[PDB]
Amino acid sequence: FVNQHLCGSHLVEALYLVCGERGFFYTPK
């Protein structure tokens, strides 16, 4: 896997991919 700062929509797409059918929760606050 990439070794880097993942921010914004890049973070979200990383989650989408890694999580599969499980889905994810994105809570940045």
Add this chain to the structure above:
Amino acid sequence: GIVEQCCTSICSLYQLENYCN
């Protein structure tokens, strides 16, 4: 949370997985 962990610093694949359902 996630921003501090994976944006502010860097996350391994395992750390990213903490945010899956």
